[PDB]
Design an enzyme around this catalytic site. Structure first.
Site: not given
Ligand SMILES: Cc1cc(NCc2c(Cl)ccc(Cl)c2Cl)c2cc(F)cc(C(N)=O)c2n1
Ligand SMILES: *[C@H]1O[C@H](COP(=O)(O)O)[C@@H](O)[C@H]1O
Length: 239
Positions: A74, A156
């Site tokens: 991510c 992320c």
């Protein structure tokens, strides 16, 4: 009587194509090796056949979503807006980074059009609904909405986004990115959205629509960042 939509029809050889894409992707990404592509195609088909091409929901695509589950690292996500050709070139170089289209589900549908029709299993190769003139809830549009959401929620660390500096709207709040992706970044996992503006000689980070992007993001308690990319082709090497 045969109904005619405003948009272009399903791409020729679309069933044969998606299936072949699935087989290729599995061959070259070893971790997907044991994905059953016939099941994947059947779930894709399943999402939109026999249905009115304007009553499509995200739930329709979930059987396929589940089969094409892929959770990429991510912290290695690259979002883009309108400037897709360059963004893919980029991930064809860096190669640890990921756009949506480098994931199975996005790889399967990139550049393709499809739709069906109510009650029969036939595919419409003559026309499909236009997102503007006919229906927002068509099979193509609902497909990208659904995967755009899951992709952006996954993200992320620092999410980078490419934008096109030759466009009048460098940031379009009505695009897939401005409309779906930006609003699904999670403040828990995402620290920064770093924007890259690509000059297709002055500072385009100052732009009003960039400043508008900064507002949306700031209100999700995520930090914003913007970098000019003056010579694009030079960025590709200097990575
Ligand atoms: C053909 C197509 C359409 C995509 N999204 C359309 C769209 C827009 Cl412009 C604005 C708001 C919403 Cl909810 C939607 Cl669904 C689309 C989106 C992508 F992220 C990627 C592609 C692609 N690679 O082909 C795409 N294609
Ligand atoms: C999600 O959506 C963008 C591209 O859609 P635009 O309509 O914003 O060009 C792409 O980055 C996907 O990740």
């Amino acid at each position: 009587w045969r109904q005619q939509w405003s948009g272009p029809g399903t791409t020729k050889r679309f069933p044969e194509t998606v299936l072949a894409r699935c087989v290729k992707y599995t061959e070259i990404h070893p971790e997907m090796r044991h994905v059953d592509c016939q099941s994947v195609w059947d779930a894709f088909k399943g999402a939109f056949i026999s249905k009115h091409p304007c009553d499509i929901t995200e739930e329709d695509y979930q059987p396929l979503m589940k089969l094409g589950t892929q959770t990429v690292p991510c912290n290695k996500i690259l979002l883009w807006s309108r400037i897709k050709d360059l963004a893919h070139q980029f991930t064809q170089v860096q190669r640890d980074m990921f756009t949506l289209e480098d994931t199975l589900l996005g790889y399967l549908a990139d550049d393709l059009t499809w739709c069906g029709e109510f009650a029969t299993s036939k595919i419409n190769y003559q026309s499909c609904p236009d997102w503007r003139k006919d229906c927002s809830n068509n099979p193509v549009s609902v497909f990208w909405k659904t995967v755009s959401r899951r992709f952006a929620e996954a993200a992320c660390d620092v999410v980078h986004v490419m934008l096109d500096g030759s466009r009048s709207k460098i940031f379009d709040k009505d695009s897939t990115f401005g409309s779906v992706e930006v609003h699904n970044l999670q403040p828990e996992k995402v620290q920064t959205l770093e924007a890259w503006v690509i000059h297709g000689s002055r500072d385009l980070c100052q732009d009003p629509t960039i400043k508008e992007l900064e507002s949306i993001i700031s209100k999700r308690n995520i930090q914003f960042s913007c970098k000019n990319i003056y010579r694009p082709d030079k960025f590709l090497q200097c990575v």
